[PDB]
Ligand binder design. Structure first.
Ligand SMILES: [Mg+2]
Ligand SMILES: [Mg+2]
Ligand SMILES: [Mg+2]
Ligand SMILES: [Mg+2]
Ligand SMILES: [Mg+2]
Lengths: 97, 156, 210, 78, 126, 60
RNA sequence: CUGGGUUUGACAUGCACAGGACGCCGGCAGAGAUGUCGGUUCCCUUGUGGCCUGUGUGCAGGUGGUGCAUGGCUGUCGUCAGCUCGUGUCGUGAGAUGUUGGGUUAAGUCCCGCAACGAGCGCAACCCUUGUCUCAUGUUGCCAGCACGUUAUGGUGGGGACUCGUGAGAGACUGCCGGGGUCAACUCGGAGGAAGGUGGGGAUGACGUCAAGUCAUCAUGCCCCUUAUGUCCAGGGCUUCACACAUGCUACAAUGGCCGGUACAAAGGGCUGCGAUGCCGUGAGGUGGAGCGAAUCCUUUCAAAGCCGGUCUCAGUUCGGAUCGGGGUCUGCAACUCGACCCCGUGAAGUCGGAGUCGCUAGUAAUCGCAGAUCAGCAACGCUGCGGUGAAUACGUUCCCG
């Protein structure tokens, strides 16, 4: 079994690339599992001071990074050139594990 | 919202101990950031010290002192004809009710003593008797206004 | 000129798609180093053929290129002498093979860059700039699939050293709506007395492309 | 905390110098430090940007860099 | 098993109500230990204080997001939502004061061009 | 964007500090990023054109 | 710029007359350039495809100048509600109607009557994130009921039922009712409800204004030079001192400070990097490295305002840290004219700052927070993105500005 977890930046590339990649295994012919996405990698980090006299608009790390985890079955040589051929969104940091 | 008339008004809660509409706005005002328990406890403890000192209801004395600490003018800065005058403006009900409490809160910290209970209690006694620090500080705001009245007809 | 940015880059992330794209881990710099060189070479050589848009993807380090010309027959006169010339030049420049596939667009009158090149050539053709713009608009708006066109020629027109900027529009050309899918083309021409620029916008229709 | 900058450019030179055990001026743009005792016994050429001032060396001299003796300017009062 | 959710602008808490003396089994501590400001302790009980039921029912809440009062209001709305799964008789008594209606006021949008939330640098009238 | 620097940067010298970023598009060494690979303006161009992700220049 | 190279070049190329050595690996003169050196001494084959040394040749290189020749773009009038085109009519005309006029709205979205009938540009319109629900739904992550647990880790079986997870859909359309509305728009209130009347402000900066920053993002004809203004490096400095000034830290203290102890979450990035238990220190740090293309590990199970305890008792002080001598740490071949940091000591203006000026009606301005890339290294406390607690006020556009 080979797992694939593609990420995204602008809240849409995640599915725009999932519905295109996870369907290539079906186009080639094989079974696949449903969607199971992970929220994000957040990793609090806060050490810096500020002017301390005009110090307002309290905000911290507005950002979203979704993950789409789905497995693949029946791995063949023709099933590896599905994503490497083109990466249209430029934000999907896909990793085949 | 701003400069387009008064926005939708927000209600105000009342306390069932004394039953007054001027003993909760002050609480909400003194509820500074992070300080809501100690100040409220001190105010509650001083509300009875004042009742014992003045021998009158904790709210009637304050209602009467609101008029004793009621000013008539407020010094401003209005520039016209190459000169900046201290042209004041007439007092209004709500404006005065707010300014009196603002001055009371600002002068309750004038005394650099440590005892906050005393700082908050002994001031109301003198204010009701006619010698409060707020009553004394309210004199200059009217003196300067009367002095600058020579050019206070522009209604601004 | 105000903030009349190219609208083609506003919906490419919602409705339309990107022209060139690839993936590079610590190699984007070296990849663009050759991409810009290929872009300069094509702008120098193939511009005479009427290139519209060069999509430059990247296979496993060898080649992935696609071009959409407008005059099929001039760039390929005799197989080997003209079609393979650019391939050999690119192979000599960059040490990688090139499986160039020259395909033709559905029509030239529907592309923004092609009509831009046409107007730039008509301007240097010494013909009246106004009549040239009118003819270009009429040719491009012969309802192939389009619904609006907007051309703006600026520079030292009229064979003088002045600075004029005409304006013309047809149909609907909304720029504040995402459901437009407007195509834009940029280019600059050089005459015997100065430089000239042309801003073109072609609105086809309200295709949501969900 | 006696491990400051090693000044390899001068370390190699003083090494090849003590390999022959001579006392000559090391012509190099070394104005960084002379921390290691291997620099003792030999003379170097200070490069402060303008000129150089020779000085004698010995063993009881430990504690500064090679250029902080006299600044790029001169103190004379008038 | 009744289990609801209560969330604020940035907070969210899973709540479950049960019959028992007043106690909030938080993630390792209690209400008096998690809300010592003495104001959040009243804000959270605001819906259960309109019709006194604190000493009659127990709460089990797992909270996250937001700060102290953020989680306080999240658990408040959580209690407001959970009170309907047992007896809707108090639904009007709660809606009259205002509950189960999260304040639509939250963080707005900002980005380059400006530096703070709907705030521009001072410009002197010269 | 000096033709000497644009070559010295991509050159392969025998030192570490002798290497720079020196964006290849034009040669502006200021604000040239790693993942983007372009200077401030060279990146903002394609950003407003929507060529790359993470671009929202809102609030005036 | 102080001085020294190359001065057909440091970086590309079309032709001549000549080559297998250029290219590279080490020392040396060295301030380095650069030159002299050692090694390699071409990959094809007779014709040269690739290489460059110099020799002649046109050329590279201009960061040499003008946003008053241009292409192309922050910030502003302004998110202000207006700006134009086809036909028709009218006057010999610049030209008028449309677009004057009534209402609600931010609005020219609507209509009404009128020589007007239509449309474009903004608005309107669509939608991201947010505000609530349903379908799809289990990993590296949560845990109800079962077990394992013992305290740094649901770490480990099982439940998608719980929200976080996010593709689609319902859901806020003046949609309905009551009063006002030519009985036309529209408005106040009532309802489910998470949001109700352009929920929230946003990408959207419209015909144009100021020849508005920028010939230093880049291209560009004319003007000027090329044994040089091209280019290399050792060093100087754009941070020098008492200043006129500015988005404007540290502070001026009881709504403050000190130390020992002390809970939550919102929540970016990691392949030549974040970097833990524990040993080394009072501290910047050092030998080392589990984990790591990561809901794990790492900024630690992950701060403080506030929070329960001890205290100073209203002062140039135990708040305040600048500067200074000295241990130095840090990344850097290089911390000296010149970066950041802890600590031993000396311990300055300043006691909430006059005339004036400036931000701010809903999670807005303050009171505790954040930094990645821009760097190998730090001015980074100003920026591009950005969490939390949480009040004050509102007679109206007479008044200053647009
Ligand atoms: Mg100028
Ligand atoms: Mg006529
Ligand atoms: Mg130099
Ligand atoms: Mg400068
Ligand atoms: Mg560097």
């Amino acid at each position: 079994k080979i797992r694939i977890r593609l990420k995204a930046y602008d809240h849409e590339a995640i599915d725009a690339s999932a519905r295109k990649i996870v369907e290539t295994v079906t186009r080639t012919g094989a079974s696949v599992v449903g969607p199971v996405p992970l929220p994000t990698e957040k990793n609090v980090y806060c050490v810096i001071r500020s002017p301390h006299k005009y110090k307002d608009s309290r905000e911290h790390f507005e950002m979203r990074t979704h993950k789409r985890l789905i497995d693949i079955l029946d791995p063949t040589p023709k099933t590896v050139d599905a994503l490497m051929r083109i990466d249209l969104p430029a934000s999907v940091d896909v990793n085949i594990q | 919202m701003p400069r387009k008339g008064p926005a939708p008004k927000r209600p105000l809660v009342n306390d069932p101990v004394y039953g007054s509409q001027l003993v909760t706005q002050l609480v909400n005002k003194v509820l500074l950031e992070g300080k809501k328990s100690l100040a409220e406890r001190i105010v509650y403890g001083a509300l009875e010290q004042a009742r014992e000192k003045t021998g009158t209801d904790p709210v009637v004395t304050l209602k009467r002192a609101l008029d004793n600490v009621k000013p008539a003018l407020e010094v401003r800065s209005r520039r016209v004809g190459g000169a900046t005058y201290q042209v004041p403006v007439e007092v209004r009900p709500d404006r005065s009710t707010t300014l009196a409490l603002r001055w009371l809160v600002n002068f309750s910290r004038q005394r650099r003593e440590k005892t906050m209970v005393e700082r908050l209690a002994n001031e109301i006694l003198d204010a009701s008797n006619g010698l409060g620090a707020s009553v004394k500080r309210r004199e200059d705001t009217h003196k300067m206004a009367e002095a600058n009245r020579a050019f206070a007809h522009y209604r601004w | 000129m105000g903030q009349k940015i190219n609208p083609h880059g506003f919906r490419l992330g919602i409705t339309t798609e990107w022209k060139s794209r690839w993936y590079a881990d610590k190699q984007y710099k070296d990849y663009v180093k050759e991409d810009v060189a290929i872009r300069k070479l094509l702008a120098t050589g193939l511009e005479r053929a009427g290139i519209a848009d060069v999509e430059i993807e990247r296979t496993r380090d060898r080649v992935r290129v696609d071009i959409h010309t407008a005059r099929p027959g001039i760039v390929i006169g005799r197989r080997g002498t003209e079609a393979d010339r650019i391939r050999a030049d690119l192979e000599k420049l960059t040490g990688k093979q090139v499986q160039l596939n020259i395909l033709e667009v559905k029509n030239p009158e529907s592309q923004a860059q092609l009509v831009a090149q046409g107007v730039a050539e008509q301007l240097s053709n010494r013909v009246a700039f106004r009549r040239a713009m009118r003819k270009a608009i009429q040719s491009a708006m012969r309802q192939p699939n389009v619904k609006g066109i907007r051309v703006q020629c600026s520079g030292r027109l009229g064979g003088a050293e002045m600075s004029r900027s005409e304006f013309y529009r047809e149909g609907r050309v909304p720029l504040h709506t995402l459901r437009a899918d407007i195509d834009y083309g940029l280019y600059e021409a050089k005459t015997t007395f100065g430089r000239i620029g042309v801003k073109v916008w072609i609105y086809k229709g309200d295709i949501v492309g969900g | 905390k006696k491990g400051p900058f090693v000044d390899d450019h001068l370390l190699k030179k003083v090494d090849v110098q003590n390999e022959k055990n001579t006392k000559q001026v090391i012509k190099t743009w070394s104005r960084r430090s002379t921390i290691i005792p291997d620099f003792i016994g030999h003379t170097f050429a200070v490069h402060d940007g303008r000129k150089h001032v020779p000085v004698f060396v010995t063993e009881a001299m430990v504690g500064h860099k090679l250029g902080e003796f006299a600044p790029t300017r001169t103190f004379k009062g008038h | 098993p009744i289990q609801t959710v209560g969330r604020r602008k940035e907070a969210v808490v899973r709540v479950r109500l049960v019959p028992g003396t007043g106690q909030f089994n938080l993630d390792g501590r209690t209400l008096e230990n998690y809300f010592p400001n003495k104001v959040h302790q009243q804000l959270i009980k605001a819906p259960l204080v309109t019709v006194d039921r604190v000493d009659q029912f127990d709460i089990y809440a797992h909270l996250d997001g937001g700060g102290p009062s953020g989680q306080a209001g999240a658990l408040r709305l959580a209690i407001a939502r959970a009170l309907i799964l047992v007896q809707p008789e108090d639904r009007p008594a709660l809606k009259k004061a205002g509950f189960l209606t999260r304040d639509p006021r939250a963080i707005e949008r900002k980005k380059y061009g400006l530096k703070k939330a709907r705030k521009a640098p001072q410009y002197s009238k010269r | 964007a000096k033709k000497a620097l644009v070559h010295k940067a991509n050159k392969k010298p025998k030192f570490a500090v002798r290497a720079y970023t020196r964006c290849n598009k034009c040669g502006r060494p200021h604000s040239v990023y790693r993942k983007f690979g372009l200077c401030r303006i060279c990146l903002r161009e394609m950003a407003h054109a929507g060529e790359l992700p993470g671009v929202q220049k809102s609030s005036w």
